[PDB]
Amino acid sequence: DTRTLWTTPDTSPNCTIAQDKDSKLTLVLTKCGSQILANVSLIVVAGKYHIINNKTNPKIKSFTIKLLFNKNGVLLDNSNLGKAYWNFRSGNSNVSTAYEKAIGFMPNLVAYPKPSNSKKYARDIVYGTIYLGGKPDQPAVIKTTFNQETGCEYSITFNFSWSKTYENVEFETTSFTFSYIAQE
Amino acid sequence: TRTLWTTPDTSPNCTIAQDKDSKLTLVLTKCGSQILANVSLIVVAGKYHIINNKTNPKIKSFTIKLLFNKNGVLLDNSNLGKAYWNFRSGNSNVSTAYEKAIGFMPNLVAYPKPSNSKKYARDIVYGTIYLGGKPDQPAVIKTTFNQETGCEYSITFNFSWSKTYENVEFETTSFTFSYIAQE
Amino acid sequence: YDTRTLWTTPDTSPNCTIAQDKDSKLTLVLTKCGSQILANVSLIVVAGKYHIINNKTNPKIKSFTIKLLFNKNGVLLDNSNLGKAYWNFRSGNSNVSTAYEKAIGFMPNLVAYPKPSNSKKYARDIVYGTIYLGGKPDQPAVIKTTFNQETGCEYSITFNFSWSKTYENVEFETTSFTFSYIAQE
Ligand SMILES: CCC(=O)N[C@H]1[C@H]([C@H](O)[C@H](O)CO)O[C@@](OCCn2cc(CN(Cc3cn(CCO[C@]4(C(=O)O)C[C@H](O)[C@@H](NC(=O)CC)[C@H]([C@H](O)[C@H](O)CO)O4)nn3)Cc3cn(CCO[C@]4(C(=O)O)C[C@H](O)[C@@H](NC(=O)CC)[C@H]([C@H](O)[C@H](O)CO)O4)nn3)nn2)(C(=O)O)C[C@@H]1O
Numbered sequence: 194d195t196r197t198l199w200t201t202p203d204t205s206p207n208c209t210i211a212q213d214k215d216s217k218l219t220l221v222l223t224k225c226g227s228q229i230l231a232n233v234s235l236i237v238v239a240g241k242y243h244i245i246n247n248k249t250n251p252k253i254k255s256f257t258i259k260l261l262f263n264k265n266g267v268l269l270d271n272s273n274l275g276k277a278y279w280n281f282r283s284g285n286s287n288v289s290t291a292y293e294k295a296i297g298f299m300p301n302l303v304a305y306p307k308p309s310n311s312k313k314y315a316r317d318i319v320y321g322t323i324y325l326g327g328k329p330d331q332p333a334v335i336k337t338t339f340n341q342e343t344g345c346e347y348s349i350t351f352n353f354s355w356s357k358t359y360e361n362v363e364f365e366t367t368s369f370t371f372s373y374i375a376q377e
Numbered sequence: 378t379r380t381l382w383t384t385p386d387t388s389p390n391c392t393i394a395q396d397k398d399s400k401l402t403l404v405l406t407k408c409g410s411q412i413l414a415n416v417s418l419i420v421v422a423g424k425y426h427i428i429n430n431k432t433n434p435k436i437k438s439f440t441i442k443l444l445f446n447k448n449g450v451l452l453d454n455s456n457l458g459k460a461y462w463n464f465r466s467g468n469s470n471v472s473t474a475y476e477k478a479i480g481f482m483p484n485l486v487a488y489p490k491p492s493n494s495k496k497y498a499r500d501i502v503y504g505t506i507y508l509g510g511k512p513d514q515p516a517v518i519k520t521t522f523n524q525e526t527g528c529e530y531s532i533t534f535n536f537s538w539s540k541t542y543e544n545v546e547f548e549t550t551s552f553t554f555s556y557i558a559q560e
Numbered sequence: 561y562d563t564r565t566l567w568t569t570p571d572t573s574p575n576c577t578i579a580q581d582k583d584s585k586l587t588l589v590l591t592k593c594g595s596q597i598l599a600n601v602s603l604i605v606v607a608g609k610y611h612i613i614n615n616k617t618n619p620k621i622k623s624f625t626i627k628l629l630f631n632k633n634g635v636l637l638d639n640s641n642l643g644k645a646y647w648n649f650r651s652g653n654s655n656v657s658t659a660y661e662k663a664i665g666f667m668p669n670l671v672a673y674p675k676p677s678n679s680k681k682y683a684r685d686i687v688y689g690t691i692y693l694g695g696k697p698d699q700p701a702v703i704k705t706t707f708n709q710e711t712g713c714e715y716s717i718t719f720n721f722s723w724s725k726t727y728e729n730v731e732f733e734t735t736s737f738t739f740s741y742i743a744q745e
Pocket residue numbers: 320321322329330331332334335356503504505512513514515517539688689690697698699700702703724
């Protein structure tokens with residue numbers, strides 16, 4: 194499937210926030226021509242962000258997952274998402290060898306330029322809210338930013354944050370859909 | 378081939394509390410591995426038509442279920458009626474009831490059926506729509522994939538609200554979401 | 561030449577007139593996924609009345625509207641707030657060289673979203689979202705999008721921006737929002 198990059202939809206940890214493989218990021222990018230249709234959720238399985246307790250830890254209120262890409266749209270190893278887990282769809286799994294090119298899935302650099310001395314516009318951000326444990330009283334903000342990281346040609350970053358004082362709440366989320374303008 | 382829908386008319390096609398009390402307008406468009414979904418609801422009669430939470434404070438939510446078999450065919454005991462749920466042709470439907478739509482079904486690995494395994498929240502999408510198009514009349518639309526029994530796939534819409542509405546007609550703005558496709 | 565996308569281009573060159581000529585860049589991308597249009601929108605105000613919001617100074621400045629009006633062929637009418645010059649089918653990061661003559665497949669569906677009439681008016685022709693000024697999560701503004709409710713046109717898409725906080729010297733430039741709507745054909 195040449196039109197979807199994804200993480201497979203299983204629950205196998207693939208992401209490192211605070212410690213190795215502490216999370217499963219489920220991310221599906223579907224190319225609808227000039228726009229990428231994106232669907233995301235997160236399951237934290239272990240470590241610092243698995244169970245939030247803001248009584249115990251009042252300043253644990255946010256964290257970031259970064260996807261960094263080179264000029265060919267290939268995932269770079271400083272990304273929180275592991276390289277072995279990210280590929281074009283084949284059935285419910287991934288192609289068995291790493292892809293060489295995915296520029297058509299990258300966030301457009303004219304729409305979303307890299308940091309510079311020029312005025313920075315907010316249109317490179319999408320805000321949404323997801324819900325921990327599927328409970329409507331457990332919001333957390335998912336802030337997605339395009340092309341704002343260094344050490345790469347392109348980037349997608351997910352910042353998760355919350356303003357409520359959660360007491361023993363597992364960090365596993367509902368799903369959110371957004372889109373962005375494609376590089377080509 | 379590419380869009381399954383209810384048609385865009387306002388003819389009731391859904392039974393929440395009594396027969397044909399509502400029009401669910403639902404459009405599913407297959408963009409490969411994801412289904413792009415667009416939904417709204419008009420209740421025209423019955424218990425959920427005109428909401429008054431001063432006289433009936435406990436009337437705060439209701440559910441509309443779409444149940445599908447192994448071939449993605451809508452089951453008769455869904456709240457949505459089978460008659461006008463089909464692949465699009467113009468502003469109407471193809472003239473033959475579809476036999477297969479597995480590519481429009483919610484992915485079972487992403488969204489497993491109920492079991493004794495852990496239930497993860499990623500099979501839910503939350504949104505908010507607005508009654509009467511008024512920005513001070515929110516209601517929550519909670520969409521859940523593959524959590525019904527007696528089917529192979531399902532999409533469930535739970536509508537709820539926390540405001541104390543006084544004689545407010547339950548007809549909504551539109552909401553867009555997506556989900557991971559079975560194949 | 562990308563016939564599946566109508567857009568404004570992704571640059572920041574002003575293309576829109578809210579209160580004075582070319583006071584803003586509306587970035588709007590309509591991508592045809594068959595029976596649905598997948599839409600992505602943001603707004604940058606660069607000058608005039610809506611550039612810098614100060615509701616201490618001007619407590620009544622709380623909202624504005626950007627209208628896109630279309631004829632029977634889906635062509636943008638020149639009384640739209642959006643200018644015709646760079647609304648066109650995509651070619652790379654720019655537009656196709658000549659103005660389009662037909663884009664009916666990008667128009668909002670008139671049965672889903674009928675023009676005003678004696679018949680009951682339903683809310684399903686509206687999409688509500690919230691965007692954030694300056695990308696700050698404590699600076700919400702509501703983006704209300706309405707299909708086919710303007711007169712003097714075959715089809716319309718209108719964006720109403722409003723806020724309910726007392727902003728003091730907040731520049732009106734937004735995060736992005738995605739929605740979809742049912743296409744006419
Ligand atoms: C989808 C599921 C869901 O909605 N879950 C919510 C959950 C459930 O509804 C209930 O649990 C079910 O029973 O409720 C949650 O909250 C419950 C408590 N609660 C309190 C109030 C009274 N409010 C409380 C309040 C909180 N704030 C914080 C400041 O607000 C902002 C800000 O900084 O300006 C708003 C920003 O959007 C937000 N940013 C983001 O979310 C980023 C994505 C920020 C940030 O969260 C913080 O800054 C941290 O960075 O916070 N302020 N107040 C005071 C209050 C009262 N009202 C009444 C007016 O509300 C409406 C209305 O009904 O008229 C609500 C409409 O939705 C709104 N319409 C629109 O937005 C159209 C698009 C409408 C209009 O704006 C208005 O009429 C003008 O036209 O206003 N408003 N504020 N209420 N509930 C929970 O359990 O935690 C939240 C769950 O999300």
